[PDB]
Amino acid sequence: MRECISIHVGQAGVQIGNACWELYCLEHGIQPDGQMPSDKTIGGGDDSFNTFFSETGAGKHVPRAVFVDLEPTVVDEVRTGTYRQLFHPEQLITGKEDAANNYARGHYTIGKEIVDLVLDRIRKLADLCTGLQGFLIFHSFGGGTGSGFASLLMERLSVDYGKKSKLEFAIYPAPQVSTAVVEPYNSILTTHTTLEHSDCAFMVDNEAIYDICRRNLDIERPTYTNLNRLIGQIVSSITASLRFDGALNVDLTEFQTNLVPYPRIHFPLATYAPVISAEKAYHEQLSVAEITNACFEPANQMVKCDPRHGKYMACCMLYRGDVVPKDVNAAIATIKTKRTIQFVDWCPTGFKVGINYQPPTVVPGGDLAKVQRAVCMLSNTTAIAEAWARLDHKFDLMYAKRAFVHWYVGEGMEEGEFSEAREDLAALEKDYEEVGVDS
Amino acid sequence: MREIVHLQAGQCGNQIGAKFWEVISDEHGIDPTGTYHGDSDLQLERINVYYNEATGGKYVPRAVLVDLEPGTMDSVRSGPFGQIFRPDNFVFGQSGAGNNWAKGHYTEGAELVDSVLDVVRKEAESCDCLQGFQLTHSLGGGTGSGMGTLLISKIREEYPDRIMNTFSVVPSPKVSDTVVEPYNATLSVHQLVENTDETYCIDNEALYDICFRTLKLTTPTYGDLNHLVSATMSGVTTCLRFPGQLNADLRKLAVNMVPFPRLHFFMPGFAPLTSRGSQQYRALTVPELTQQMFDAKNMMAACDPRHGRYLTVAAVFRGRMSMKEVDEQMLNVQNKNSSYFVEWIPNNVKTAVCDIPPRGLKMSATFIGNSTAIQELFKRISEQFTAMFRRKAFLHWYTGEGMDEMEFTEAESNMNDLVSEYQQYQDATAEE
Amino acid sequence: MSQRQVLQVFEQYQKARTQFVQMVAELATRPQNIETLQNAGVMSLLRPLLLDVVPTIQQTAALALGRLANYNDDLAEAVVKGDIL
Amino acid sequence: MSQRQVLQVFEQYQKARTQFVQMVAELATRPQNIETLQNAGVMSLLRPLLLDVVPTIQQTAALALGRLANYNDDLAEAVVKGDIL
């Protein structure tokens, strides 16, 4: 039935998958051992856990995910954790040499060595499943493991399965802050692969996360744990109608069909709400209209872009928790008449209604409070094209005198791809502005 | 004997059908188990129209649930009355429609269609003689709109001598649920006007407004709308379910209500829509019912009938009042409101009173009319479809399925022809 | 289903060219992209466009070849040099 | 717009090539397939397999057809019925 396979490439992908799995186990009452030892006082678990987990003959739950990494240090770090009794060691493939923010080695001399192993793993996982809809590929553009290895694997997955949905989730190199220097070098190569060989791609960054946490959660020393928690909550909200039901169930296909207006424009803008701390959720009356209006605020966007620079074409609306349809109708009536929000002169309306009866849960030790209902937004606008413009500018000003290119030449690749990627990005941007231009 | 076969399509269609089944079971006195717990008189003779005679008097429903997603059967089965239906009729696929009419019709409409044809032919041969088939679906998705029209076409092709009535849900630019909804509406209207006897218009926004401003509900949800549409269809079908003095049937209205085959749409409506604090302060009489069946405020349309001229009117009553009041009311209405109906056709109102009052309410009356108010919906749908099709947005998805784009061209050509016909019949002048 | 897919794939390439053609009913009016694609002796690639199976395709493939030939002397002589006459 | 048109035309040309070759090679192995291709009405649609200009399409196709028409008078006569001869 509604079952999907998650793919985790790189340290970021592995930790994001860990956060997602732990969120799923805490929200479904799944114990870290893998059994149901709660024989005295029950606390839930009688639901449809088949979407992600599996039920054995002895009552065991086996995760359905792919934890691959070229560096073994992350695999060792996860292995010594408290959840080592949940997954299987065959699912965490180590490696001798890693990419570590390099596309050349991780795409030719490193990623091409372990192909059959992961292919057999994913084939076995797919055979163990009955109904397959899409995939959850978690990687990063800055990380060499999450860029070269991810590209080469998805290129084979696309040609091996055309009828299945291919999603994408990674991290965007912020124009202001960054972790490494060669991030644009891997990004300019991964964008072409994710554009000409995938169906949908979700693009997020970290500076917006830092801004929203310091503004709402009010923390002075942030950490990656809350960053992963936010992404896990976003993913759970996206795939909410699959594990459970509601008034209007919205499956992966149901929203993916409309979220893609064109084969070239498939980069939605995600926005989660409410992103608040414990104290920010007590003396605050929360309704649907206010949070829906706040979702369009650029400060609450995970991508640093002003929506007023461009306009919207396609919008995907979701909900999770005790939400009343009258509030949704009132919010839609309010936003359709707002002059601040810009939209194309041809599409008068577009959005979805996903009613989820199950309210979001909390985690002991996290920062999220007990909120009666949640909301997530996936819109499509041309105002986000500035990020590609800045990335192209940076690549051009780094490519004039060929900085840190001799390494890639020595590793083995054809230099014309830089020109190919540059011209492909230029054409894609041109298409974006052509679409953004009305009559 | 004379029975009606009921069909299901779409998750919204499934839920409204389940609500209707629950309503009729409660009204006719059926326990959730499956036996009979009624105490009335006419609830045993003609009860076989929707049920089937079996051993131990355990009547079974007659409805086939067609869906592409397995997630609806579990929801509709877990209810207080989901264990009484036929699990064999729950024919669901493995892949969802994704709100795609073309993909559902092509992919999920070839290998799954044979089973539903087999079960419906088995049900048809199980009975002696039938009249028509009722299908409740919504155009908001690839499940109801993609499959119902196909099943409709097939049943017309196999049994042309049958009534084809449906209660599909019309879209609204104000309240949307699908980005490609105009495309699906445009594709479905072609089959609705080509291969369908009659069609009733259903809008959710108008029902929401009606309940908010008259019922004054705290937290209105889809359950209230399902209750309202179930009561609407119950008032529609009581002409045959519960015979009275002046009984009617679906084909008689279908002939007397439809001047031309290309215009078969209607405008349903129920009279007593009051608030909770107003149920104990009301005057049960004829002129009140007439005013609530004539005004646009009570009507469940997301439009204004006052912008055009009334074409045909059918007033179906359900109670014990008289006959003179109805004719005098319609006469004085036609005399006064002369500029609201077609002057070339006198006596555009049809009288129908059911002597059997409903269960739980004493006086009830529904409104089935075809007024000149859908033209605005038609023209706005045509405009939005033209705007979408100009630059060909959201079209690669349909193109990849295999079907071409000429279908949209012919659909919009038929759309323009139909609207031209509608507006040149709106001004039905007497002479030059 | 295999035999039905036999028929289906044959008719699918058939209707694929049919649709290219019912589009070039209006695509042929635009010469700049015609030349952009054409520069590499693609008159040879338009040679099999008469090898075009049923009336549903040929019918407007001719309407294509027409506006293809209007653009200059050379494209009207291409039906000669391409041995398409 | 005609450039992307010709692109799509030629990737569908190539998928037609691959599908035609694979299916002609596959469906020419069993006698019941011979009789079905006789009765399925394939050959009016398989007429392009001796018509088009593609080398690999036609070579694999007509070799399988030589396998196909070998089993019986039936398939070879339906080849006439498909107006391929």
Q: What does the alpha-carbon distance between residue B111 and residue B121 come to, in Å, rounded to a whole number?
A: 17
For residues B260 and B245, what is the distance between their CA atoms, to the nearest angstrom?
Answer: 29
Pairing of strands A132-138, A202-204: unpaired
Using DSSP bridges, classify how beta strands A165-166 and A132-138 pair: parallel, antiparallel or unpaired.
Answer: parallel
Residue A379: closest C-alpha in chain B: B179
Q: Positive or negative CA dihedral for B294, B297, B299, B304?
A: positive
A292 is in an annotated binding site: no
Q: Which residue has the tokens 């630059």?
A: B391
* Residue A65, phi then psi, degrees to nearest 5: -155, 165
Pick from B99, B91, B98: which is nearest to B70 by CA?
Answer: B91
Q: Kindly list the structural domains of chain B, giving each domain's residue range(s) and its CATH number in brackets, ordered by start.
A: 3-257 (3.40.50.1440), 265-374 (3.30.1330.20), 375-425 (1.10.287.600)
Question: Is residue B355 within 8 angstroms of chain A, CB to CB?
Answer: no
C30 touches C71 (CB < 8 A) = no
For chain B, what's the residue count?
432
**A126: Cβ contacts below 8 Å, ≥ 6 apart:** A5, A132
A248:B396 CB<8 A: no
Q: Could you give the 3-state DSSP secondary structure of residue B98? A: coil
Which residues in chain A have their CB less than 8 angstroms from residue B397's CB?
Answer: 257, 260
Shortest distance between the Cα of D42 and any Cα of chain C, in A, equals: 6
Element holding C3 (H helix, E strand) = helix C2-27
DSSP letter at B358 equals P
Cα–Cα distance measured from residue D58 to residue B414, given in angstroms and rounded to the nearest whole number: 43
Q: What is the CA radius of gyration of chain A?
A: 22
Picking from B12, B76, B176 by the largest number of A CB atoms within 10 A of its own CB, the best residue to mutate is B176
C15/B404 CB distance under 8 A: yes
Other CB atoms within 10 A of residue C50 CB: 11
According to DSSP, the residues that pair with A271 across neighbouring strands are: A377
The single residue of A155, A207, A254, A429 carrying the catalytic annotation is A254
Strand partners, B169: B202
D32 touches chain C (CB under 8 A): no
Residues of B in contact with C23 (CB under 8 A): 405
For B134, the enclosing helix (H) or strand (E) is strand B129-136
Q: Which of A206, A8, A184 is nearest to A103 (CA)?
A: A184
* Long-range contacts formed by A230-235: CB under 8 A, 24+ apart: A230/A272, A230/A275, A231/A16, A231/A19, A231/A20, A231/A169, A231/A204, A232/A16, A232/A19, A232/A20, A232/A23, A233/A23, A233/A272, A233/A360, A233/A368, A233/A374, A234/A270, A234/A272, A234/A376, A235/A20, A235/A136, A235/A169
Nearest partner of A247 among A321, A314, A301, judged by Cα: A321
How many other C-beta atoms are found inside a 10 Å radius of the C-beta of residue A34?
Answer: 20
Decide: A175 and A387 in contact? Cβ < 8 Å: yes
Which amino acid is residue A148, in one-letter code?
Answer: G
The continuous run of DSSP H or E covering B198 comes out as: strand B198-199
Give yes or no for a contact between B377 and B303, defined as CB atoms under 8 angstroms apart.
yes
3-state SS record for chain A: CCEEEEEEEHHHHHHHHHHHHHHHHHHCCCCCCCCCCCCCCCCCCCCCHHHCCCECCCCCECCCEEEECCCHHHHHHHHCCCCCCCCCHHHEECCCCCCCCCCHHHHHHCCCCCCHHHHHHHHHHHHHCCCEEEEEEECCCCCCHHHHHHHHHHHHHHHHCCCCEECCEEECCCCCCCCCCCHHHHHHHHHHHHHHCCCCCEEECCHHHHHHHHHHHCCCCCCHHHHHHHHHHHHHHHCHHHHCCCCCCCCHHHHHHHHCCCCCCCCCEEEEECCCCCHHHCCCCCCHHHHHHHHCCHHHCCCCCCHHHCCEEEEEEEEEECCCHHHHHHHHHHHCCCCCCCECCCCCCCCCCCCCCCCCCCCCCCCCCCCCEEEEEEEEEHHHHHHHHHHHHHHHHHHCCCCCCHHHHHHCCCCHHHHHHHHHHHHHHHHHHHHHCCC
Amino acid identity at A204: V
Q: Which among B179, B208, B219 has the least Cβ separation from residue A314? A: B179
Q: Which residue has the tokens 């076995």?
A: A124
Neighbours of A401 (CB within 10 A): 7
b/e A142-158 (16+ beta carbons within 10 angstroms → b):
bbbbbbbbbbbbbeebb
Which residue of C10, C22, C56 is the best one to mutate when testing the B interface, meaning the one whose CB has the most B CBs within 10 A? C22
Is the separation of the CB atoms in A114 and A95 below 8 Å? yes
| Separation between Cα atoms, residue B115 and residue B95, nearest integer Å | 16
d(CA B366, CA B235): 6
- From chain A, the residues in CB contact with B70 under 8 A are 1
Contact of C16 with chain D, judged by CB distance below 8 Å, is answered with yes
Of A227, A284, A272, the closest CA to residue A375 belongs to: A272
Q: What is the resolution of this structure in A?
A: 7.7
The question of whether A434 is a catalytic residue gets the answer: no
Structure tokens at A344: 């194309």
Give the N- to C-terminal CA distance of chain D in Å, as an integer: 39
Best residue in B107, B390, B398, B404 to probe C by mutation, most C CBs within 10 Å?
B404
Cβ within 8 Å, pair B71-A248:
no
Distance of CA A7 to the CA centre of its chain: 11
The residues pairing with B265 across neighbouring beta strands, listed in sequence order, are B199
What distance in Å separates the CA atoms of residue A42 and residue A111, rounded to the nearest whole number?
46
Cα distances (angstroms) measured from residue B425 to each of A157, B212, B262: 58, 35, 12
Q: Give one word for A404, left, alpha or beta, with left for phi > 0 and alpha for psi -120 to 50.
A: left
Neighbours of B414 (CB within 10 A): 16
| CB–CB contacts below 8 A, C to D | 81
Among the residues of B107-176, which ranges form H helices? 113-126, 144-158
The rounded distance, in Å, linking the Cα atoms of B166 and B152 is 10
B244: helix, coil or strand? coil
Helices (H) and strands (E) in chain D, counts: 5, 0
Query: Residues in chain C, how many?
Result: 85
> Is C82 in contact with C48 (CB distance < 8 Å)?
no
- CA atoms of A256 and B392, how far apart (whole Å): 18
Q: What are phi and psi of C26, to 5 degrees?
A: -120, -15
Q: How many CB atoms lie within 10 A of CB B19?
A: 24
- For chain A, the residue count is 439
B16, B229 Cβ separation under 8 angstroms: yes
Nearest to D52 among C4, C45, C51 (CB): C51
Q: Taking the alpha carbons of B170, B173, B174, B176 in that order, is the dihedral positive or negative? A: positive
Element (H, E) at B7: strand B2-9
What is the Cα–Cα distance from B240 to B316, expressed in whole angstroms?
12
Beta-carbon neighbour count of residue A139 at 10 Å? 28
Residues C4, D41: C-beta atoms closer than 8 Å: no
Nearest to A55 by CA among A28, A83, A78: A28
The CA-CA-CA angle for residues A414, A419, A421, to 5°, reads 95
Bridge partners of residue A6, in order along the sequence: A65, A136
Which residues of chain B are at the C interface, by a Cβ-Cβ cutoff of 8 Å? 402, 404-406
Joined tokens for residue B198: 């009659």
The answer to the question of whether B69 is labelled as a binding residue is yes
Cross-strand bridge partners of residue B85: none
B402–C12 C-beta distance less than 8 A: yes
Q: What phi and psi values does residue B227 have, to the nearest 5 degrees?
A: -60, -45
B404/C22 Cβ within 8 A = yes
Å from B235 to nearest chain A CA?
A: 26
The answer to whether the CB of A307 falls within 8 A of the CB of A383 is: yes
C15 contact residues in B (CB cutoff 8 A): 402, 404
Cα(B102)–Cα(C8) distance, integer angstroms? 17
State yes or no: B143 annotated in a binding site: yes
Q: What H or E segment, with its residue span, contains residue B353? A: strand B349-354
Do A332 and B175 count as a contact with CB atoms less than 8 A apart?
yes
CB-based contact B316:B369 (threshold 8 Å): no
Query: How far is the C-alpha of B142 from the C-alpha of A15, rounded, in Å?
Result: 38
